[PDB]
Structure 1
Amino acid sequence: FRPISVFREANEDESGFTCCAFSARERFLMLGTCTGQLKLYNVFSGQEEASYNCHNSAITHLEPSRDGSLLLTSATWSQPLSALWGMKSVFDMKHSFTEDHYVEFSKHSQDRVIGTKGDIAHIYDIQTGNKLLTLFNPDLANNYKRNCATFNPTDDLVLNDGVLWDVRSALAIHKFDKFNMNISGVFHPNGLEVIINTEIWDLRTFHLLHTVPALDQCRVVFNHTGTVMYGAMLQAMKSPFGSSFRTFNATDYKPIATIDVKRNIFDLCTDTKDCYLAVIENQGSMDALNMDTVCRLYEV
C-alpha cells in the first residue's frame, strides 16, 4: 500500500468527506460529504470538478452504476433517506427511498435497487421506482445492528439480516445462525459462498468452510476481480470504523496485510482496474467540533 495521493475537500475549513466510490471514469472519484453533497474529484491533484447537493444530512453511502448513468446515495437523517440520481447530461433525482438507510444496485443486470430499512429489505424497479418486494420474516430475523441487504452476483438470491432469500419465490431458503450483534453478511463474488462476520458458509451445502477471526466486526469490500477482500472493523461525531483495515486472499481467506492508518476510517473502495485503494481517513478525533477527513489513495 504505497500512498500515491492525498486530498482534502475544497472550499471547507474542515474537510467533510464521508464516503467514496470510483466513477465510471478513471482517475475521478465520487465522494459524499457531511453536508450531503456529492462531489467529483481528480484523485491525483485533488481538484474538485463538480458538486451537487443530494441531501440535507451527511452522505453515508454512494454507489455509481457501472454504465455511468445512475448513482445511489444514502444519508444519515433526511427524508427521503436514500435516493437514485441520474448523471447523464444533467444531474437529477430519479427516485427516492423514504426510510431506507442503505441501498445497492443489483449486480448482473443493474435494473433494480435493494434498500434496507432496519431488519427489512425492499427491492425496487429502477425504471418505475416501484417497490416490487419486501423481504422480512419476523420469525427468522437476527436484528443485526448494521444490517445491509444485498443481492448475489446473479441477482436471484438476497442476504437480509442473516437470512438467505430466493428472489423469484420471495421465500426464505435458510437462516444463518447469529454469532455477532452487528455484521449481517455479504456474498462472495464467486456466487458459492457467503461471508457473515467471522463465518464463511457454503451456499450448496451450508457447511462452515472457514473461520476468519480477523474479519470480526468488519465491513467487507472486494476488489473488482474478486481476488482480494478488504475488511475495516467497526469502531468499538462517531466514525463508523476504526483506524485499521485488513486484506485477505478471497480464494483461501488467508490474511495478506493489516494496515493501521492511525486515523478513523469512514469508507474505502477500489477502482475497476484494481490499481488503487481509496480510503476516507479522519484527521480529527470523534471529539472534534468538526470532522476533517482526507482521501488517501494507495497503489495496491
Structure 2
Amino acid sequence: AFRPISVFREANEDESGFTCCAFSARERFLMLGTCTGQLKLYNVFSGQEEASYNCHNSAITHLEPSRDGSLLLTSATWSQPLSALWGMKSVFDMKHSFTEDHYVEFSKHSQDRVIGTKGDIAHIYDIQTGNKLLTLFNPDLANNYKRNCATFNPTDDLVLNDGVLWDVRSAQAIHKFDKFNMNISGVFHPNGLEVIINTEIWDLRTFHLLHTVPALDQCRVVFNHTGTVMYGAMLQADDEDDLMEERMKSPFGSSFRTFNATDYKPIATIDVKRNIFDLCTDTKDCYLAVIENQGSMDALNMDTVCRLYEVG
C-alpha cells in the first residue's frame, strides 16, 4: 500500500532538476538537491518552493540532514569541494568541506563525526574542528568496490569500508568479507547484528552467511526508523558502449522493493515506470518521498518530479 499523497516538480523550470531529497527538521518540508547544485526547501503537500541555496556548481548526488536539524551533508558530481557540511541553524552557511570525498555520511549514534569516501579509502572527520581524524585503507585487504561507500555501524564503534570491517578505536581492520560483486560494498543492519553486502547477509558475531538474497543485487538500501522494513533499489547498469541517452541519466532503475528487515523475505515490488533518483521517509515512517524522472531519451536533460506516498 503506497497511496499517492502529493506530486510536484521544480518551480519555474521547464526541465525539473530534482536529484535527491530528505525530510527537513521542520515538519511538512522536504530538502531536495538539484542538477544545478542547488539545495531547495519545498512544502511536500502544497508543492510550493520555500527556499533555495547555492551549494555546488555541479549536480547534487546525495545529501543527509543531521537528526537535530543543525547540519546538512551534501555531495556533488564534479565540483570542488566534492562534499560539504553546511550549517542550517539560523543562517545557511558552509561549516566544512571534504575536498575529494564523493560521498559522506554522519556518524549514527552520536553525530559528532563525518565519514567520507574517496575510491577505496575512508576518511573520518571531527564535525567541530573539521579535522581528518582517521584515514582507513589496507591494500592487503582491499576489495576495490567500484561503488564503495564507507559507513559507521549503529554504535559508531565499527566502520565498513570496501567490504572491510574496521575497529574505530584501534583503527585496525578486523575482518575482510570476500568479494562477490564488483560494485556494492555493503552496509550495517540497524540491529547491529549483521552486515548486508549486496546479496550476502553476514552475521557480525560469527561471520557466517545468514542469508542469500538475490533480489538485493546492486541495490542501495534504507530502513524505516523502527528497523523492521528495508527498501532496496537496483542501481542503473552502466553497460559499456551503450547508446548515448542511456549512459547514466539516472542512478537507479524504475523499481524499488520492500523486505522484512528480520527474515529478508520480499514484501512488495513497486515499478513506478520512471527511473528513480532517490527516496526517503520521515522520522515517523508515515511517508515515502521518491524522485522519479519523466520524459524520454529525446530529452537532453532530466525532468524529475517528487512523489509522496503513504506508507501503508
1:133 equivalent in alignment to 2:134: yes
Task: Report if aligned partners of 1:238, 1:286 keep a CA contact under 8 Å in 2.
Answer: no
Name the residue aligned to 1:274.
Answer: 285
User: What per-residue deviation string (whole Å, max 9, x for no partner) do you get for residues 177-226 of structure 1?
Assistant: 11111111110000011000001000000000011111111001111111
Q: Retained in 1: the 8 A contact 2:249–2:302?
A: no
Paired with 2:166 and 2:104, the residues of 1 have a C-alpha distance of 17
Q: CA deviation at 1:139?
A: 1.3
Q: Deviations over 1:93-127 (max 9, x none)?
A: 00000000000000100000000001100000000
1:143-165 Cα deviation digits (max 9, x unpaired): 11111100000001001010010
Is the 2:228–2:262 Cα contact (8 Å) retained in structure 1? yes
* C-alpha RMSD of matched pairs (Å): 0.9
What CA distance in whole angstroms lies between the structure 1 residues aligned with 2:35 and 2:116? 21
Change (3 A) 1:286 1:95: farther
Deviations 1:241-260 (A, max 9, x none): 10000110101111000000
- Of stretches 77-86 and 277-286 in structure 1, the one that deviates more from structure 2 is 277-286
Q: Deviations over 1:1-58 (max 9, x none)?
A: 1111111011111100000111122211100000000011111111111100100000
Shift of residue 286, structure 1, vs aligned partner:
5.3
Shift of 1:265: 0.4
Alpha-carbon separation, structure 1, partners of 2:15 and 2:249:
16
Name the CA distance, whole Å, in 2 between partners of 1:147 and 1:199: 16
Long gaps (5+) in structure 1 = none
Number of residue pairs matched by the alignment: 300
- Tell me how far apart the structure 1 counterparts of residues 132 and 200 of structure 2 sit (CA, whole Å): 32
Name the CA distance, whole Å, in 2 between partners of 1:256 and 1:286. 32
- 1:95 touches 1:129 (CA, 8 Å); kept in 2? yes
- Contact 1:269–1:278 (CA<8 Å) still a contact in 2? yes
1:287 deviates by: 5.5
Q: Does 1:233 align with 2:234?
A: yes
Q: Which moved more, 1:19-28 or 1:118-127?
A: 19-28
* Deviating more after overlay: 13-22 vs 281-290: 281-290
SS of aligned partner of 2:130: coil
1:113 aligns with 2:151: no
**Which of 107-116 and 134-143 deviates more?**
134-143
Q: 1:243 aligns with which of 240, 254, 260?
A: 254
Distance (whole Å) between structure 1 residues aligned to residue 60 and residue 226 of structure 2: 27
**Alpha carbons 1:239, 1:286 under 8 Å: kept:** no
- Residues 259 and 203 of structure 1: CA distance in aligned 2, closer, same or farther (over 3 Å): same
Query: What is the identity percentage for the equivalent residue pairs of Structure 1 and Structure 2?
Result: 100
CA distance in 1, matches of 2:142, 2:186: 13
Counterparts of 1:135 and 1:30, CA distance in 2: 31
Q: 1:261 to 1:88 in 2, by over 3 A?
A: same
Q: CA deviation at 1:285?
A: 3.7
In structure 1, C-alpha distance between the alignment counterparts of 2:167 and 2:297, rounded to whole Å:
40
Q: Distance in 2 between matches of 1:146 and 1:3?
A: 32
Q: Find the aligned partners of 2:197 and 2:205 in 1 and give their Cα distance.
A: 16
Give the Cα separation in 1 of the matches to 2:268 and 2:310: 14
Distance 1:295 1:179 in 2: 34
Q: TM-score, normalised by structure 2?
A: 0.95
**Partners of 1:176 and 1:205 in 2: how far apart?**
12
The residue matched to 1:214 in structure 2 has which SS? helix
CA distance in 1, matches of 2:177, 2:109: 24
Given the two structures, how large is their TM-score scaled by the length of structure 1? 0.99
Shift of 1:288: 2.0
The SS at the match of 2:233 is strand
Compute the displacement of 1:284 (Å).
2.4
Q: Does 1:5 align with 2:6?
A: yes
2:149 alignment partner, SS class: coil
**Inter-CA distance 285–206: structure 2 relative to 1 (3 Å threshold):** farther
Matches within 5 A, 1:128-167: 128-167=129-168
Query: 1:200 aligned to 2:201?
Result: yes
